[PDB]
Amino acid sequence: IVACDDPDFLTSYFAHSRLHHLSAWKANLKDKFLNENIHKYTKITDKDTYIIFHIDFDCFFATVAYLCRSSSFSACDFKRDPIVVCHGTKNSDIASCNYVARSYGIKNGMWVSQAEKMLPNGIKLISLPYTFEQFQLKSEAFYSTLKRLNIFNLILPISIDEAVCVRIIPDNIHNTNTLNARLCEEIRQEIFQGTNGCTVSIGCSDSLVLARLALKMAKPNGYNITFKSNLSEEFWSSFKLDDLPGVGHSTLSRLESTFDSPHSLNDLRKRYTLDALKASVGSKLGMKIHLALQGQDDEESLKILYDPKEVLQRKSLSIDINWGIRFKNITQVDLFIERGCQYLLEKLNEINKTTSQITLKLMRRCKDAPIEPPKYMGMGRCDSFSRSSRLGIPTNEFGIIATEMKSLYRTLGCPPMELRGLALQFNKLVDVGPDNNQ
DNA sequence: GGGGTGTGGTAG
DNA sequence: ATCGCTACCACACCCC
Ligand SMILES: Nc1nc2c(ncn2[C@H]2C[C@H](O)[C@@H](COP(=O)(O)OP(=O)(O)OP(=O)(O)O)O2)c(=O)[nH]1
Ligand SMILES: [Ca+2]
Ligand SMILES: [Ca+2]
């Protein structure tokens, strides 16, 4: 047990937090890409015609947690029992569930208690612990197999378990669905062998958005090949509105309001006008959805292909702690803020940069919300407050940065016992070069 | 046209 | 119990 005023709190929280791990894995994969290509010019040009293979482990955490389960879960069966990965027993997030569990309507992000109600009597839920080290080891095998296949010109890391892989097609060569199926099957086979039991599904297309949709269509443990030329009503009819990239719950809600609760992309496709779309959700998002409903990427999504080194280049740096926050006085809040700054500055020095603008964000208990929320140590219902500040000269000096952070906290006026959440941000980063004469 | 701020939303 | 992170685009609204 490590409380928020204990010096070891940040380390222990991060060691336990799957969301932290997802972010740290993603950032390290982006840096590793940038290094390996420091002199290689890996880029797609307008000269190229390319095919996109979008590859993703199926139920990653669940699968790996199963394969590596301790002897205490030896008899559990991935194909027959509903399996989730989670820390706890009641209001604990389900980080991953297998497709058996999904067959009863369980979804990632659900609390265990709710997912327990969704099972008939006699069927028991299996709760496996996280295995973060082996999650990373299986990913290494994933990216190592991808590279040694030598069939891709650009291998883009999306996350620990997910990658967008790009093959350039010579006009000299006739690409066929026979070759593409074979590549998919090779990819799937090799990865199942290299990871010793994990499965990936693959979306294969000539746009990124179609490759993502194809991938959803491909799951579980399969592959799908859908080019712009194969688009059809049967295709669009098989997708929910929030299968579109960029469409989360808030955009979904707005689209359902504007267009009479479409229940598939085909419904939305046949009912929408671009103007009303822009009006409903926003001009740029409206245009991206419009382009996507034709199977076409917008210019914003396309940048990762034509200039991947600037897309994967870290532009800001931050930490967020919105769990376990229970401070009794301002002194303890200030020490926590310093611990956070120290951690962030360690990271900033690794990447040899300075910051010119910083931000403090906090969560504050809503005035009518219980002091102890339903989730043990959760933030509960909160109001958000942020404030930023430009620094005079770019710096990496703890003294300057931590002082401004604690001052930023001061101006937001949040009583320490009402604090439920804190984020610390370095918003603008500035390279440090060999020349540092004033 | 250029800048500024805080807030919202998405995604693994 | 239980580990509700974090990067970055877009937008509303302000200044010149
Ligand atoms: N989407 C989502 N995934 C999470 C979250 N926390 C942990 N994860 C885990 C689930 C996966 O094991 C891993 C990658 O996310 P995915 O989108 O691929 O979901 P998952 O692999 O569990 O199932 P699927 O790919 O649809 O077969 O991250 C979360 O809050 N949201
Ligand atoms: Ca996955
Ligand atoms: Ca996702």
- Method in brief: X-ray
Give, using CA atoms, the residue closest to atom 5 of ligand 1: A95
Measured from the Cα of A220, ligand 1's closest atom is 27
Cα dist. A155→A193, A200, A212 in Å? 20, 16, 15
| CA terminus-to-terminus distance, chain A | 47
Please give all residues whose beta carbon lies within 6 A of any atom in ligand 1, as ranges. Answer: A 18, 22, 56-61, 95-96, 108-109, 161, 219
Residues near A422 by beta carbon (within 8 Å), at least 6 away in sequence: A320, A321, A322, A325, A336, A337, A340, A360, A361, A362, A363
From residues 245-264 of A, list those within 7 angstroms of strand B by Cβ.
Answer: 245-252
Burial environment of residue A435 by CB neighbours within 10 A (0 to 12, 13 to 18, 19 or more): exposed
Strands in A151-280 per DSSP E: 154-159, 162-169, 200-205, 223-225
Q: What is the DSSP letter of A392?
A: E
Residue A125 backbone phi and psi in degrees, to 5:
-80, 135
Closest to A158 in 3D by CA, of A248, A25, A41: A25
What is the distance between the alpha carbons of residues A18 and A20, in angstroms, rounded to a whole number?
5
Which residues of A sit in the known binding site? Answer: 18, 56-60, 96-102, 108, 161-162
Residue nearest B8, CA–C1′ metric: A250
Tokens 């991953």, located at residue: A96
Q: Is the CB of A19 under 7 A from strand B?
A: yes
Q: Is the CB of A314 under 7 A from strand B?
A: no
Closest to A51 in 3D by CA, of A231, A223, A175, A201: A175
Give, using CA atoms, the residue closest to atom 2 of ligand 1: A108
Instruction: Identify nearest nucleotide to residue A373 by CA to C1′ distance.
Output: C4
Q: What is the DSSP letter of A382?
A: E
Strand pairing class (A200-205; A223-225) = parallel
Q: Which amino acid is at A233?
A: E
Tokens 């973060």, located at residue: A132
Distance A145 CA to C2 C1' (A): 36
SS3 at position A184:
helix
**Nucleotides on strand C with an atom closer than 7 A to protein CB?**
1-12
Q: Which amino acid is at A300?
A: E
Which ligand is in closest contact with the Cα of A221? 1
